Structure 1
Amino acid sequence: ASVIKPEMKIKLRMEGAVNGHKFVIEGEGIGKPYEGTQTLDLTVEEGAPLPFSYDILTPAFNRAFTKYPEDIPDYFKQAFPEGYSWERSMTYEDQGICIATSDITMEGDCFFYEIRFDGTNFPPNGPVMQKKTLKLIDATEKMYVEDGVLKGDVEMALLLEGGGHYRCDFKTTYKAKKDVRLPDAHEVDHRTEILKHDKDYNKVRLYEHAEARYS
């Protein structure tokens, strides 16, 4: 949508709690919506230092930053300037669970996210609470229309120290704030990388590259 410029700024605030630990993280960044790329600088403002793996947070920190082919309707870019929200359930293989939501709006050349993140039931000696995850493994999200909105299903894994995979299934519901042309079922490939961080991850620079396709 012509309101989506080739370069868009980002500002965000996340409030949440994981296994009883409350925290607030804010972020500023910039990305290229039509290239599917974005970089965020994230700062823990309350609850530092986080006692849990930062990798459970990174997909919560905007599918407007997805390269969409012209023959797949772009649910996310169509939704602006009004915007959209998303709601996400995440279930980890050791029964840790998370619920995250985001309300995404836009003013001028900047997106604004209001993010909520809640997680619980992580085993206190498991890889999340012991910060034993290395990264998110590249994953594919299956997008499909249901109940008049776009949904995405993901079976992905975090890489653990020692090479094990730590599996998480999540399901996201994406809700445009106005009617848009709904796409047929498709896929979004994600690559997610923490580019840099300070010692306690109070400061994190986070990158994503995402592209939509069929098959």
Structure 2
Amino acid sequence: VIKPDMKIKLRMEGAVNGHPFAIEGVGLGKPFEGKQSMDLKVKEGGPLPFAYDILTTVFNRVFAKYPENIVDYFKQSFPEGYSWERSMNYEDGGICNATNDITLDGDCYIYEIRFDGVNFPANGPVMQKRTVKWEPSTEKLYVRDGVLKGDVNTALSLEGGGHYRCDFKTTYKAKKVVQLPDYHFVDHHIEIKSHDKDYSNVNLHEHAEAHSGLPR
């Protein structure tokens, strides 16, 4: 089911502080290498008046190099697929709620994304587009009550110096009964490699591999 080279198609519908928008994207990736790429276009609600870096982490942990020591919860969910839900709680009070329903049609992954964020102050880095990039992170995934959850508090590097923190609470739910893994980690690094002035066209990348921390 898992081919070494797969395609991505998505459609995000959402709103931030009451401003609705829609974005579509297309891209490629290699699940066994943990790297993926896509290009997204704003289709409704443009130009986006908020920092584009708050949607980048919503735009599939299938793309993660899993060793043979760690159980891959995501590659085992196909061809049925899985869905995840996530809340991102920023330190200044802004919270973004996101959901994604992932299915497989041959070599292409089809996403169904909903993204809503509220309580972003007008003087903050999000509404003032003063974010540069997400810093590298290390997500921690653990199984709780039959589903696997992923938690990490990471940060955005701000234009001028300093960091803007965000606390992620993700829950992954497969559509099919699969074998659940142990407490392990997944390192991330997401970066925007190309965009326009109004971020109407964005090229996003992600690199991820799973590890188990420092050995005992």
Superposition deviation, residue 113 in structure 1: 0.3
Kindly report structure 1 stretches of 4+ aligned residues shifted beyond 6 Å.
none
Any idea what SS the aligned residue of 1:124 has?
coil
Q: CA RMSD in A?
A: 0.5
What is the number of equivalent residue pairs in this alignment? 213
| Pairing partner for 1:50 from 48, 51, 55 | 48
Q: Distance in 1 between matches of 2:108 and 2:116?
A: 26
Superposition deviation, residue 188 in structure 1: 0.4
Residue correspondence of structure 1 range 78-97 to structure 2 within 5 A: 78-97=76-95
Superposition deviation, residue 162 in structure 1: 1.2
Q: Distance in 2 between matches of 1:187 and 1:163?
A: 28
Q: Deviations over 1:113-163 (max 9, x none)?
A: 000000000001110000000000000000000010110001100000111
**Residue type at the aligned position of 1:68:** Y
Superposition deviation, residue 102 in structure 1: 0.1
2:15 maps to: 17
> What residue ranges of structure 1 are gaps of 5+ in the alignment?
none
**Residue type at the aligned position of 1:7:** D
**Residue type at the aligned position of 1:37:** K
**Residue type at the aligned position of 2:194:** K
2:197 maps to: 199
Q: TM-score, normalised by structure 2?
A: 0.98
Any idea what SS the aligned residue of 2:74 has?
helix
| Pairing partner for 1:176 from 174, 177, 180 | 174
**Residue type at the aligned position of 2:168:** F
Q: Distance in 2 between matches of 1:193 and 1:126?
A: 21
**Residue type at the aligned position of 1:132:** R
Q: TM-score, normalised by structure 1?
A: 0.98
2:98 maps to: 100
**Residue type at the aligned position of 2:75:** K
Q: Distance in 1 between matches of 2:127 and 2:196?
A: 19
Q: Deviations over 1:43-88 (max 9, x none)?
A: 1000110000000000100001110001211000000000000000
Residue correspondence of structure 1 range 104-115 to structure 2 within 5 A: 104-115=102-113
Identity of aligned residues (%): 74
**Residue type at the aligned position of 2:132:** L
Any idea what SS the aligned residue of 2:112 has?
strand
Residue correspondence of structure 1 range 127-146 to structure 2 within 5 A: 127-146=125-144
Any idea what SS the aligned residue of 1:55 has?
helix
Q: Distance in 2 between matches of 1:38 and 1:28?
A: 11
